Ligand binder design. Structure first.
Ligand SMILES: CCCCCCCCCCCCCCCCCC(=O)OC[C@H](COP(=O)(O)OCCN)OC(=O)CCCCCCCCCCCCCCCCC
Ligand SMILES: CCCCCCCCCCCCCCCCCC(=O)OC[C@H](COP(=O)(O)OCCN)OC(=O)CCCCCCCCCCCCCCCCC
Ligand SMILES: CCCCCCCCCCCCCCCCCC(=O)OC[C@H](COP(=O)(O)OCCN)OC(=O)CCCCCCCCCCCCCCCCC
Ligand SMILES: CCCCCCCCCCCCCCCCCC(=O)OC[C@H](COP(=O)(O)OCCN)OC(=O)CCCCCCCCCCCCCCCCC
Ligand SMILES: CCCCCCCCCCCCCCCCCC(=O)OC[C@H](COP(=O)(O)OCCN)OC(=O)CCCCCCCCCCCCCCCCC
Ligand SMILES: CCCCCCCCCCCCCCCCCC(=O)OC[C@H](COP(=O)(O)OCCN)OC(=O)CCCCCCCCCCCCCCCCC
Ligand SMILES: CCCCCCCCCCCCCCCCCC(=O)OC[C@H](COP(=O)(O)OCCN)OC(=O)CCCCCCCCCCCCCCCCC
Ligand SMILES: CCCCCCCCCCCCCCCCCC(=O)OC[C@H](COP(=O)(O)OCCN)OC(=O)CCCCCCCCCCCCCCCCC
Ligand SMILES: CCCCCCCCCCCCCCCCCCCC
Lengths: 606, 504
C-alpha cells in the first residue's frame, strides 16, 4: 500500500517521455509507453486494493512532503486512501486503461500519437491526484490539472478552429467553476484554519456553534465548483460543444475522469454538507433539474455523440440527486456503473464513426445492425444499461438504489423527477438506437476492452460493490413492500419507455414527423436542441459584453488620458513660441510690459 | 562585505566588455557571461552562507549582511548596502535573468556589441543596487541610474523592423515616466529627511534612522503619495502603465533588454521595504485606494492583453495584470499575502522571461509579431509552440507552476483581510485564463493565415532550448517545492508585517 504514489508517478513518467519524444518514436513504442504506464498504474491499484482489503479496510495515509508552510497556513503533499478513494482510483485506472488500449488501436495513423498519449497520461495522473488528495488545495491541483488536460485533449485536432473554440469554452466554463471552488477554499481556511478533509469535519461543529452562515457559503461554493466540473446547472453548456474531440477523449472525460470529479467532491466533503442541510437539498434539486433538462435535450439531438453527451449530463444529474437525498453509496455505485456503460457506449460510437468514414447525423443512417453486428450488440447492451433495463443491467440496480434512497428520506418530488427522467432516458436512448441501427441501408487490441466493458455493463458490474462502509454514512433502509413496488415501478417505467420508443421510431416515423412538423413541435425542438438556450444566454450576458469592452478598450484609453499632458505641453510651447517673432520693437514692448507688471505687482502686494 | 562586489562586478564587467572588443567581435559575450556567472555565484554563496531558513524575525532593521562607506558626508549620505531574505531573493533572480540575457544575445556579432554588453551590465548592476541600497539617496541614485542605458538600448539597438522615430518615442516616454516619478520620490525623500532633521537635528538619509520619525497625519500621507507615485509608475499601476507595452514593443529583438530591466520588479520590493515601514499609518489609510487600483489593474491588463494583435504587447499587459495582483497583496498587512507576493514576483519573472525569450525566437523564425499573420505553427516548429504552451499555462496560474502558489497565497491572505477584493481578483484569474488561451489559439493553433506561417521553420538552438528548459524546470520546482523560497524570505516579510500592523 506504500506504492500509492506510483499510481501518479507512472502516468507522469509516461507523459514526460511521450512529450519529449515529440513523435520521433514508433507508434508501437509510443503505444507501449502510454498504455503500459496506465496499465502499470492499474496493476498497482489492484495490488493496493488487495492490501486494503487484507488490512480490514483501514484508511491509509502517505505524506510525501509539505507543499507550503507560512505560519498557521500548512498545506501538505499527502495522499490518503479510504474506500471512496479506492473506488474512484480503481474506476479511473481500470477504465482509463481500457480506453488506452482502445485508443492505441483507434488512433493509428494519426498525427500526434505521442502527444495524444502524453495528454491522456497527464489526465490520468491529474485525476489520481484529485481523488487521492487529503486536503482541498492538493485536490485543487488535481482539479485544475484535470481541466487543463481536458482542454488539451478536446482541441486535439488543432487545425480545425471549431475544436479549439470548443476547448477554450470548456476550459473557461470549468475555470469559472474552479473560481467558485477557490472561494470555498478561502472561506474554509479563514474559518477552520485547515483544508484537510478529516480535520475540517472535526473542527467545523465546534467552530460553527454560534453562527453557521459562513459554512453555508463554503458548501454553496463547493457546489458551484462541483457543478462546474461535472457539467451541471448552471455551468453545463461546455459538455455538448466540448464533445468535438476524438472518441477516447470523450470516453475518458464522460466515463472515467472529468465529470465524476464534482460527485467525488460532494461525497468527500459530505460532513460539511451534512451540517448545512439546505445546501444539500439544493444539490439534490440541481441534480434533478439538470437530469430533466439533459433528458429533454437528448430527446431531440440529431447526433449520436451529442445524445451521449446529454445522457452523461443526465446520469451525473442522477448522481447529484443521490447526493442530495443523502444516498451516498447509491451515488458512488451509479458513478462506477455509469463509467462502465458510458465508456462502452462511447467506444462503440467511435467504432460506428470509423466504420462510416465520416461523422453523419442519425437520420442519414439506418439498418446498421447488418453491417456491424458486434458494434450493434455493444450499443444495445450499453443502451440497456443506460436506460436501466431491469434484472440484466447494473444501471437498473444503481438507479434503484438512488430512487430507494430518495424515497426513504422523505424526498417524494425528487423521486418523481427521477422516475420521469428514467422514462425519458429509455425514450431518447432507444430513439437513437432504433433510428441509427434499424431501417434501410445506405452506405485483439480493441475487442478485449469492448468485451470487458460489455461484461461490466451487465449484472456482473452490479456484483461489484464499492467498500464505502465506514467512509460514507449508510442510507436509511426502505421497507420490503416499498422497495418491491419501487423496483416494479422503475422496471415498468423503463420498459414502457422502450416500448414507446419502438412504437415511435422503429417503424415508419409518421406520428413523430407529425409532432415535429407542427409549430409547437418545431418550437420545442428548436428550444431543446440548443439545450434550452443557456449557451445563447451566456453569449448575450457574458461573451458579447466582454468582446465589446475589449473592442472599446483596445486603444488603451488610460494611456491617452496620461498622454494628455504631453499634448498640452506641446500646444503651450507652440503658443509661447509666437512671442519669438524676431521683432526688436516687440522685444522692447515686452520689456516695458514686464516692467509695468512687476511694478503693479509690487504696489499691490506692499 | 560582498555587497559592493555584487554591485561592482557588473560595472567592471561591462567596462571590460566595451574595452575587450578590440581583441575580437566574439570576445565581449564571453566577458559578459563570466561577469553574470560570477555575480550569480556570489549571490548563491550569500544564500548558502546566510542561513536564512533559520533566521527569526527580530524587528526592522534586521540585516544578514551590511556594508557602509561615507559618500556625501555633508548631507549624511552613505554608500550603505544591506541584504536580508527578500533582497537576497531579488538579487539571485537578477543574476539568473542577467545570465539568461547574456545567453539570449549570444549570436549578435554587431560592430558595437561591446557597448551593448556594457549597457546590459550597467542595467543589471543598477537593479542589484536598487535591491541592496538602504540609503535613501543611494536607492534613488540606482533607481534613476539604471534608466539611461535602457533608454539608449531601446532607442539605438531596438526593434529594427520598426522606424527609428517609434523607438525614440517609446524610449523617451519610458524615460520621462520613470524619471519624473523618480523626481517626485526624491521630493518625498527630501521632505522626510527635513522633517527628521527638524525633529532631531541630524543630517541623515539612512532608512534605519528615518523609520522613527514623528510626522503629522497628512504630511505622512503626502510623503507616502510621492513614494507610491514612483513605485506605481514602475510597478506598473494603472493608469501609469502604457510606457511598459511601448518599451516592450520597441525593445531589441533578442529579448535580452526585456530580461534586463523591463521585467525585474523593483517597485513591489520598494513598496514592501520603504513604503510600508516608513509610512505605516499613511499606507493603512491608502490601502482601499491601492487595492482598488490593483483590481482595476488586473482587469484592465487582462482586457488589454486580450485585445492585442501583437504578442509582445500581450505579454506586457499580462505583466500589468499580475502586478495588480501583487499590489493588492502588499496592502493587506498579511504574512501569507506577503509571502505569496514574493512567490508571485519570482514566478512572474521566470514565466515572463520564458514568454519573452520564446517570442523573440518566434520573431526570429517568422519575421513578424502580428498574430493575424501566423497560425497553425504547432505543425511547423519543433520545440517552440509546446514550450510557449507551457509558459502560457504557467501565466494563467496553473498548479504545478509557481504562479499558482504565489497568486493563491495572495488570495488566501487577502480573503483573510478583505474578501470582496479577493473574489473580484479570482474572477480576474478567469480573465487571465481567457487571454492566455486566446494567445495560444491565435498563434499556434488553427490554419496558417499567411505564407510565412505555412512553411517549415528551423529548429531552436541547443543553448536556447537549454535555458528555456532551465526556466521550465525552475517554474515546476517553484510550483511543487516552494518551501526554500518561503523560508528565505520569512524573517524579512515577518519584520515588515509586524512593523506595519504594530504601528497602526
Ligand atoms: C502531483 C503528482 C504526485 C507527486 C510526485 C510528482 C510531483 C512533481 C514532480 C516534479 C517536482 C518535484 C518537486 C519535489 C520533489 C521531492 C522533494 C521534496 O519535496 O523533498 C521533501 C521531502 C523530505 O523533506 P520533508 O521534511 O519530509 O519535507 C517537508 C518539507 N521540509 O522529500 C521526501 O520525503 C521524498 C519525496 C520523494 C518524491 C519523489 C517524486 C518523484 C516524481 C517524479 C516525476 C517525474 C516527472 C516530472 C515532471 C512532471 C510534470 C510536471
Ligand atoms: C503533476 C501530476 C498531475 C497534476 C496536475 C498538473 C497540472 C499542471 C501540469 C503542468 C505541466 C505542463 C502542462 C502542459 C505541457 C504541454 C507540453 C506539450 O504539449 O508537450 C507535447 C510536445 C510534443 O508533442 P508533438 O506535437 O508530438 O511535438 C511537437 C511537434 N514536433 O512536447 C514537446 O514538444 C517537448 C516537451 C515540451 C514541454 C513538456 C512539458 C514541460 C513541463 C513538465 C515537465 C518539466 C520538466 C521535468 C522536471 C521538472 C523538475 C523536477
Ligand atoms: C450552483 C451554485 C452556484 C452559486 C452561485 C452564487 C452566486 C455567485 C456568487 C459569487 C460571489 C460569492 C462570494 C462568496 C463568499 C463571501 C464571503 C464573505 O466574506 O462574504 C461577506 C462579504 C462582505 O464582508 P464584510 O461586509 O466586509 O464583512 C465580513 C467580515 N467583516 O461579501 C462578499 O464577499 C460578497 C462579494 C460579492 C461580489 C459580487 C460582485 C463581483 C462579481 C464579479 C466581479 C469581477 C468580474 C467583472 C469585472 C470587474 C472589472 C472591474
Ligand atoms: C434561473 C433559472 C435557472 C434554471 C431553471 C431552474 C428551475 C427550478 C425548478 C424548481 C424550483 C426550485 C426548487 C424548489 C423550490 C425551493 C425549495 C422548496 O421549497 O422545496 C420544497 C420541497 C421539498 O421540501 P422538503 O423535502 O420538506 O425539504 C426539507 C429539506 N430542507 O419540494 C422540492 O424541493 C421539489 C423539488 C423538485 C425537483 C425540481 C424539478 C421538478 C420541479 C420543477 C419542474 C420544472 C423545472 C424546469 C423544467 C425541467 C424539465 C421539465
Ligand atoms: C407527474 C409527471 C408525469 C409525467 C408527465 C410527462 C413527462 C414528459 C414526457 C415527455 C415525452 C413524451 C413522449 C412523446 C413525445 C416525445 C417524442 C416525440 O414525439 O418526439 C418528436 C420530436 C422529436 O423527434 P425527432 O426524432 O427529432 O423527429 C424526427 C422527425 N423530424 O419531438 C419534438 O419535436 C418535441 C415533442 C414535444 C412533446 C411534448 C412535451 C411535453 C412536455 C414539455 C415540458 C416543457 C418544460 C416544462 C414546462 C416549462 C414551462 C412551459
Ligand atoms: C508636479 C509633481 C510634484 C508635485 C508638486 C510638488 C510637491 C507639492 C507638495 C505640497 C505640500 C503641501 C503642504 C501643505 C501644508 C504646509 C503647512 C503645514 O502643515 O506644515 C506642517 C509642517 C511644518 O510644521 P512642523 O512643526 O515641521 O510639523 C511636522 C509635521 N510632520 O510641514 C512639514 O513638516 C513639511 C511638510 C511637507 C509635506 C510633503 C511635501 C512633498 C510630498 C511629496 C510630493 C507631493 C505629493 C505627491 C505628488 C502629488 C501629485 C503630483
Ligand atoms: C503643463 C500643464 C500640465 C503639467 C502640470 C500638471 C499639474 C502638476 C501638479 C499636480 C499636483 C498639485 C499638488 C498636489 C498636492 C497638494 C497637497 C495639498 O493640497 O496638501 C494639503 C494638505 C497638507 O496636509 P496638512 O493637512 O497640512 O497636514 C498637517 C495636518 N494634517 O494635504 C492633506 O491633508 C492630504 C491631501 C491628500 C490628497 C492630495 C494629493 C492628491 C494627489 C493626486 C495624485 C495621486 C493620487 C493617488 C495615487 C494615484 C495612482 C498613482
Ligand atoms: C451562470 C450563473 C452563475 C454565473 C457564473 C459566472 C458566469 C458563467 C458563464 C459561463 C459561460 C462562459 C462562456 C465563455 C465562452 C468562451 C469561449 C468562446 O466562446 O470562445 C470564442 C472566442 C474565441 O476567441 P479567440 O481566441 O480570439 O478566437 C479567434 C477566433 N474565434 O472567445 C471569446 O470571444 C472570448 C470569450 C471570453 C468570455 C469571458 C467570460 C467571463 C465570465 C466572468 C463571470 C463573472 C461573474 C460575475 C458577474 C457580475 C455579477 C454581479
Ligand atoms: C530566485 C530564483 C528561484 C528559482 C526557483 C527555485 C524554486 C525552489 C526549488 C527548490 C529545490 C526543489 C527540488 C529539490 C528538493 C530538495 C529537498 C531538500 C530537503 C530534503
Amino acid at each position: 500500500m506504500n506504492m500509492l504514489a506510483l499510481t501518479i508517478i507512472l502516468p507522469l513518467i509516461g507523459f514526460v517521455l511521450l512529450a519529449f519524444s515529440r513523435g520521433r518514436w514508433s507508434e508501437n513504442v509510443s503505444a507501449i509507453v502510454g498504455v503500459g504506464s496506465v496499465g502499470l498504474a492499474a496493476l498497482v491499484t489492484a495490488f493496493i486494493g488487495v492490501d486494503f482489503f487484507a488490512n480490514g479496510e483501514q484508511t491509509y495515509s502517505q505524506p510525501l512532503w509539505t507543499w507550503m508552510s507560512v505560519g498557521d497556513f500548512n498545506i501538505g503533499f499527502n495522499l490518503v486512501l479510504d474506500g471512496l478513494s479506492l473506488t474512484m482510483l480503481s474506476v479511473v485506472t481500470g477504465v482509463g486503461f481500457l480506453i488506452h488500449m482502445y485508443a492505441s488501436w483507434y488512433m493509428r495513423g494519426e498525427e500526434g500519437y505521442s502527444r495524444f498519449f502524453a495528454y491522456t497520461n497527464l489526465f490520468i495522473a491529474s485525476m489520481v491526484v484529485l481523488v487521492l488528495a487529503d486536503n482541498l488545495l492538493l485536490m485543487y491541483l488535481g482539479w485544475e490539472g484535470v481541466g487543463l488536460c481536458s482542454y488539451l485533449l478536446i482541441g486535439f485536432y488543432y487545425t480545425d478552429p471549431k475544436n479549439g473554440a470548443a476547448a477554450m469554452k470548456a476550459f473557461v466554463v470549468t475555470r469559472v467553476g474552479d473560481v467558485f471552488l477557490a472561494f470555498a477554499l478561502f472561506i474554509l481556511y479563514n474559518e477552520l484554519g485547515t483544508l484537510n478533509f478529516r480535520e475540517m469535519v472535526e473542527l467545523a461543529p465546534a467552530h460553527f456553534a454560534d453562527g453557521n452562515n459562513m459554512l453555508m457559503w463554503a458548501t454553496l461554493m463547493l457546489l458551484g465548483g462541483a457543478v462546474g466540473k461535472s457539467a451541471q446547472l448552471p455551468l453545463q453548456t461546455w459538455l455538448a460543444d466540448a464533445m468535438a474531440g476524438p472518441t477516447p477523449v470523450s470516453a475518458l472525460i464522460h466515463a472515467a475522469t472529468m465529470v465524476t470529479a464534482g460527485v467525488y467532491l460532494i461525497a468527500r466533503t459530505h460532513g460539511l454538507f451534512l451540517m448545512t442541510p439546505e445546501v444539500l437539498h439544493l444539490v439534490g434539486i440541481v441534480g434533478a433539474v439538470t437530469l430533466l433538462l439533459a433528458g429533454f435535450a437528448a430527446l431531440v439531438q440529431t447526433d449520436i455523440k451529442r445524445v451521449l453527451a446529454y445522457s452523461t449530463m443526465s446520469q451525473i444529474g442522477y448522481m447529484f440527486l443521490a447526493l442530495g437525498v443523502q444516498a451516498w453509496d447509491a451515488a458512488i455505485f451509479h458513478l462506477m456503473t455509469h463509467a462502465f456503460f458510458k465508456a462502452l457506449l462511447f467506444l462503440a460510437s467511435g467504432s460506428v464513426i470509423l466504420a462510416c468514414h465520416h461523422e453523419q447525423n442519425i437520420f442519414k443512417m439506418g439498418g446498421l445492425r447488418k453491417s456491424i453486428p458486434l458494434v450493434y450488440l455493444c450499443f444495445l447492451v450499453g443502451g440497456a444499461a443506460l436506460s436501466a433495463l431491469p434484472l440484466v443491467t447494473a444501471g437498473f440496480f444503481s438507479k434503484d438504489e438512488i430512487l430507494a434512497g430518495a424515497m426513504a428520506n422523505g424526498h417524494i418530488n425528487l423521486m418523481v423527477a427521477g422516475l420521469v427522467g428514467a422514462f425519458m432516458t429509455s425514450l431518447y436512448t432507444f430513439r437513437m438506437i432504433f433510428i441509427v441501427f434499424h431501417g434501410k441501408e445506405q452506405i485483439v487490441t480493441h475487442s478485449l476492452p469492448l468485451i470487458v466493458l460489455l461484461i461490466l455493463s451487465t449484472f456482473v458490474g452490479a456484483l461489484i460493490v464499492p467498500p464505502l462502509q465506514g467512509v460514507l454514512p449508510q442510507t436509511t433502509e426502505l421497507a420490503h413492500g416499498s422497495m418491491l413496488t419501487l423496483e416494479i415501478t422503475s422496471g415498468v417505467v423503463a420498459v414502457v419507455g422502450i416500448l414507446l420508443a419502438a412504437w415511435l421510431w422503429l417503424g415508419k416515423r409518421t406520428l413523430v414527423t407529425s409532432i415535429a412538423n407542427s409549430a409547437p413541435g418545431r418550437l420545442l425542438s428548436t428550444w431543446w436542441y440548443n439545450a434550452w438556450g443557456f449557451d445563447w444566454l451566456y453569449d448575450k450576458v457574458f461573451v458579447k459584453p466582454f468582446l465589446g469592452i475589449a473592442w472599446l478598450l483596445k486603444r488603451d484609453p488610460l494611456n491617452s488620458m496620461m498622454n494628455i499632458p504631453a499634448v498640452l505641453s506641446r500646444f503651450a510651447g507652440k503658443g509661447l513660441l509666437l512671442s519669438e517673432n524676431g521683432y526688436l520693437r516687440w522685444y522692447v514692448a515686452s520689456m516695458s510690459i514686464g516692467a509695468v507688471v512687476v511694478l503693479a505687482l509690487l504696489m499691490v502686494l506692499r | 562585505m560582498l555587497l559592493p562586489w555584487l554591485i561592482l562586478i557588473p560595472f567592471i564587467g561591462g567596462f571590460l566588455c566595451w574595452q575587450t572588443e578590440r581583441f575580437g567581435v566574439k570576445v565581449p559575450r564571453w566577458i559578459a557571461l563570466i561577469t553574470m556567472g560570477l555575480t550569480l555565484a556570489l549571490s548563491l554563496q550569500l544564500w548558502l552562507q546566510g542561513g536564512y531558513s533559520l533566521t527569526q524575525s527580530a524587528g526592522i532593521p534586521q540585516w544578514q549582511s551590511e556594508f557602509d562607506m561615507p559618500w556625501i558626508p555633508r548631507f549624511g549620505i552613505s554608500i550603505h548596502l544591506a541584504i536580508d531574505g527578500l533582497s537576497l531573493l531579488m538579487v539571485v533572480l537578477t543574476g539568473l535573468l542577467g545570465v539568461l540575457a547574456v545567453l539570449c544575445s549570444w549570436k549578435e556579432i554587431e560592430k558595437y556589441q561591446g557597448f551593448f554588453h556594457l549597457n546590459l551590465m550597467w542595467i543589471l548592476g543598477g537593479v542589484i543596487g536598487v535591491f541592496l541600497a538602504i540609503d535613501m539617496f543611494l536607492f534613488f541614485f540606482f533607481w534613476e541610474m539604471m534608466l539611461v542605458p535602457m533608454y539608449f538600448l531601446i532607442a539605438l539597438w531596438g526593434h529594427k523592423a520598426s522606424d527609428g522615430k517609434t523607438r525614440i518615442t517609446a524610449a523617451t516616454k519610458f524615460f520621462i515616466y520613470t524619471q519624473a516619478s523618480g523626481l517626485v520620490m526624491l521630493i518625498a525623500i527630501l521632505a522626510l529627511v527635513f522633517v527628521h532633521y527638524n525633529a532631531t537635528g541630524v543630517w541623515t538619509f539612512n532608512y534605519e534612522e528615518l523609520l522613527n520619525t514623528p510626522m503629522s497625519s497628512g504630511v505622512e500621507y503626502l510623503l507616502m503619495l510621492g513614494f507610491f507615485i514612483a513605485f506605481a509608475v514602475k510597478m506598473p499601476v494603472v493608469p501609469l502603465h502604457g510606457w511598459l507595452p511601448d518599451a516592450h514593443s520597441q525593445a531589441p529583438t533578442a529579448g535580452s533588454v526585456d530580461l534586463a530591466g523591463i521585467l525585474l520588479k523593483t517597485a513591489a520590493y520598494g513598496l514592501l521595504r520603504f513604503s510600508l515601514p516608513l509610512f505605516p499609518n499613511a499606507s493603512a489609510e491608502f490601502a482601499p485606494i491601492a487595492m482598488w487600483l490593483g483590481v482595476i489593474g488586473i482587469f484592465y491588463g487582462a482586457w488589454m492583453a486580450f485585445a492585442q494583435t501583437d504578442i509582445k504587447r500581450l505579454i506586457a499587459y499580462t505583466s500589468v495584470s499580475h502586478m495588480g495582483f501583487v499590489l493588492i497583496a502588499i496592502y493587506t498587512g498579511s504574512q501569507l499575502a506577503y509571502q505569496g507576493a514574493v512567490i508571485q514576483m519570482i514566478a512572474h519573472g521566470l514565466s515572463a522571461a520564458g514568454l519573452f525569450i520564446l517570442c523573440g525566437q518566434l520573431y526570429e523564425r517568422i519575421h513578424t509579431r502580428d498574430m493575424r499573420m501566423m497560425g497553425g505553427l504547432w505543425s511547423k516548429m519543433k520545440w517552440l509552440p509546446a514550450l510557449s504552451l507551457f509558459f502560457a499555462v504557467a501565466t494563467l496560474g496553473m498548479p504545478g507552476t509557481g504562479n499558482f502558489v504565489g497568486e493563491f497565497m495572495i488570495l488566501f491572505g487577502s480573503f483573510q483581510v478583505v474578501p470582496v477584493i479577493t473574489v473580484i481578483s479570482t474572477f480576474g484569474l478567469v480573465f487571465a485564463s481567457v487571454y492566455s488561451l486566446a494567445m495560444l489559439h491565435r498563434a499556434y493553433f488553427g490554419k496558417a493565415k499567411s505564407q510565412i506561417a505555412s512553411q517549415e521553420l528551423p529548429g531552436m538552438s541547443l543553448r536556447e532550448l537549454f535555458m528555456i528548459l532551465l526556466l521550465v524546470v525552475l517554474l515546476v520546482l517553484l510550483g511543487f517545492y516552494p518551501q526554500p523560497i518561503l523560508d528565505t524570505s520569512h524573517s524579512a516579510i515577518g519584520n515588515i508585517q509586524q512593523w506595519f500592523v504594530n504601528s497602526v
